[PDB]
């Protein structure tokens, strides 16, 4: 029933993914995008400095899937990371690791294009991972790499998934990840940001993530989160800490879009409620002491 040898080719792999998808309540595509992200994360985890410390830490929506699992988290198109070295070192090293492969998987990485963010001197970079399995093309994953800010690469947590084990690829998955205080600081800053005149802030989906993150924090001291929020808000030097959590006019339907699939969780069902929940979280963080 569980597979004793790895899949011999892509068809047998897709076929096993679909049997696992139905076997436990997921759409085939969500599970496939998740396997592709696990594979990309394993390529990123082979990038070590001369002490063995990771060079890339996963963040954003990919981190949250790993933390909570597929059923209890938002679908994440992006695979975002924070590097502790320059991209040119990062991009060459991924192509290397992508060529060596991992348990049948191989990857090709398009060229990094700088993107524009006005609060960071070092600009973020986006490119794409074209995955293959035993030679045959498998999936395409957007990647976002950005620079360290304050101490957000100082520590990491190491998350695992057993998705690939279900389809008979037994090797352990262990992905270094940005810690929650810094995920909270970054999403808080992005969700309360006011942008330049061409564009508007569409990030109502971050109000879901911030409610998930507050649960994962549980009853821990918030002093590390407060320190991290102070640090991100000062370094970027856009709007000040503590921010006001403003709802924009198109956000009701975007927010409702970000809740798809999460009926079982205890989350605010409307955007106004979500904003309030996030504002009380902000007030909690700001009051933290010793
Ligand atoms: Mg085939
Ligand atoms: Mg299926
Ligand atoms: Mg199966
Ligand atoms: Mg460097
Ligand atoms: Mg590219
Ligand atoms: Mg710091
Ligand atoms: Mg650590
Ligand atoms: Mg963010
Ligand atoms: Mg505290
Ligand atoms: Mg602290
Ligand atoms: Mg105001
Ligand atoms: Mg909905
Ligand atoms: Mg609704
Ligand atoms: Mg609170």
Author numbering: 3 to 292
Paper text:
We found that while Rv1045 encodes the guanylyltransferase TglT (unusual type guanylyltransferase-like toxin), which arrests bacterial growth, Rv1044 encodes the atypical protein kinase TakA (unusual type of atypical kinase antitoxin), which neutralizes the activity of TglT via phosphorylation. It encompasses an N-terminal domain (NTD) and a C-terminal domain (CTD). The NTD (1-181aa) exhibits an α/β fold that commonly found in nucleotidyltransferase-like proteins. A large central cavity is formed between NTD and CTD.
To shed lights on the origin of TglT phosphorylation, we determined the crystal structures of a selection of mutants, S78A, D82A and E146Q. Similarly, the crystal structures of TglT mutant D82A expressed alone and co-expressed with TakA did not have electron density for the phosphate group next to S78, suggesting that the D82A remained non-phosphorylated in the presence of TakA. On the contrary, while no electron density was observed for S78 phosphorylation in the crystal structure of TglT mutant E146Q expressed alone, we observed clear electron density for a phosphate group connected with residue S78 side chain in the TglT mutant E146Q structure co-expressed with TakA, resembling the structure of the wildtype TglT. These results suggest that while the TglT mutant D82A prevented phosphorylation of residue S78, the TglT mutant E146Q permitted phosphorylation and more importantly the phosphorylation of TglT was attributed to TakA expression. D82A (motif 2), either expressed alone or co-expressed with TakA, exhibited a single band in Phos-tag PAGE. The band was slightly higher than the non-phosphorylated species observed for wildtype protein, but was lower than the phosphorylated band. Collectively, D82A remained non-phosphorylated in the presence of TakA. While the expression of wildtype TglT inhibited bacterial growth, mutants G62A (motif 1), D82A (motif 2), K189N (motif 3) and D208A (motif 4) were non-toxic.
